């Protein structure tokens, strides 16, 4: 069974933050086997907490773990810049126990004011459609923290097929940029009243919409 983590959490230096990991009564609710891993960009994960609350030798006492019901939680006190990383919860794997990891949580240690994304949605060009192809282009920039959720809709219905989204990458100003592309056939583009790019940042969702015709 899946373990659910928030997509992203953030805090300022010196502050305390908590990352949740929700399972079911059959997994997290039954065993003291939830572990937490820290992963820096381009590095292998590192075990921070095992067995819900135990720290391996050498791990800072600023990291602690707990559990209540079906939710295990990692708490980091006195946030330092080096704490900025992705964090995963997972269960013990071996013997009768099958492994599972949570989806991960990006932790940002705030170094500048939070900034909402600037979103621009472009419809397929006349040239691309003439070439019997169609691509919707959703450009997301100047956001901080560097975590977003991008989703697409065909009219009011969700669409997953033909979607290619980048992971956020740091711009020269330390804010982030990301982009998402939706590939369609020219018929799919003209058959719908509209297509939408939905961008969620820090619990704020903006939806940009394009239509194939003016009336």
């Amino acid at each position: 069974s899946a373990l659910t983590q928030p997509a992203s959490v953030s805090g300022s230096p010196g502050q305390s933050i908590t990352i949740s990991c929700t399972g079911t009564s059959s997994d997290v609710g039954s065993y003291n086997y939830v572990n937490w891993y820290q992963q820096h960009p381009g590095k292998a994960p590192k075990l921070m907490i095992y067995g819900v609350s135990k720290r391996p030798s050498g791990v800072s006492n600023r990291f602690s773990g707990s559990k209540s019901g079906n939710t295990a939680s990692l708490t980091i006190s006195g946030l330092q810049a080096e704490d900025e990383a992705d964090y995963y919860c997972g269960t013990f794997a071996g013997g009768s126990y099958y492994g599972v990891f949570g989806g991960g949580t990006k932790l940002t240690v705030l170094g500048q004011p939070k900034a909402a994304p600037s979103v621009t949605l472009f419809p397929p060009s006349s040239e691309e459609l003439q070439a019997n192809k169609a691509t919707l282009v959703c450009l997301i920039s100047d956001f901080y923290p560097g975590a977003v959720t991008v989703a697409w809709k065909a009219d009011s219905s969700p669409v997953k097929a033909g979607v290619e989204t980048t992971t956020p990458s740091k711009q020269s100003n330390n804010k982030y940029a990301a982009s998402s592309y939706l590939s369609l056939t020219p018929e799919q583009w003209k058959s719908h009243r509209s297509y939408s790019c939905q961008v969620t940042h820090e619990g704020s969702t903006v939806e940009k919409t394009v239509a194939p015709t003016e009336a």
Partner: protein, 211 residues
């Protein structure tokens, strides 16, 4: 110190197989399980299975049953993971980790599954302060450089990092924010360069004609 060393990065075509090794040092190999986990680029950790280094007994994740094999050679303290009938979405860093708690991880083995070969982009105008741009589709490998008006236009230009598509090809967009008053009088041309394929494209971006 406990260490798990993994074999080197590989690139495989769809349908092929890959065999990753994981060699232990700094502890007694047979005293702990070896777990296998993978991570697609920008995605999360995914468990693949566990092997008991004493018996060689295995547990495979349901998602991979039928095409994943795990073995070990205790004489050289090495565990192996072989994944067959590779797909594009098997592109990932593959890790081994020690014990049920995954308390030490190997450095990871990057496996890319692709049939992509050198290809120049197709460029499309993104008609329009106003935002206008150029869509640079389906090229391989990186990089593409984009200039505007042969380098005359630099202010307000943002060329986005490329998306690496499930097809194995890249696409990117370059956008420029300009005063909306200039749309009727100023010409905007993006100049796309893809040195690996020796392709250069100049594309005029016209304002989205009223009526």
């Amino acid at each position: 110190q406990v260490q798990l060393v993994q074999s080197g990065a590989e690139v495989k075509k769809p349908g092929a197989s890959v065999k990753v090794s994981c060699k232990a040092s700094g502890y007694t190999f047979t005293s702990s399980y070896i777990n296998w986990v993978r991570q697609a680029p920008g995605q999360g950790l995914e468990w693949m299975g566990t092997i008991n280094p004493v018996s060689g007994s295995t547990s495979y994740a349901q998602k991979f049953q039928g095409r994943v094999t795990m073995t070990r050679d205790t004489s050289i303290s090495t565990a192996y993971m072989e994944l067959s009938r590779l797909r594009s979405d098997d592109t990932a860093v593959y890790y081994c980790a020690r014990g049920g708690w995954f308390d030490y991880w190997g450095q990871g083995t990057l496996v890319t599954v692709s049939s992509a070969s050198t290809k120049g982009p197709s460029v499309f105008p993104l008609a329009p302060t106003a935002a206008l741009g150029c869509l640079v589709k389906d090229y391989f490998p990186e990089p593409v450089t984009v200039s505007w008006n042969s380098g005359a236009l630099t202010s307000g230009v943002h060329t986005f990092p490329a998306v690496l598509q499930s097809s194995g090809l890249y696409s990117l967009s370059s956008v420029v924010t300009v005063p909306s008053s200039s749309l009727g009088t100023q010409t905007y041309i993006c100049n796309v360069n893809h040195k690996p394929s020796n392709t250069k494209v100049d594309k005029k971006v016209e304002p989205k004609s009223e009526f």
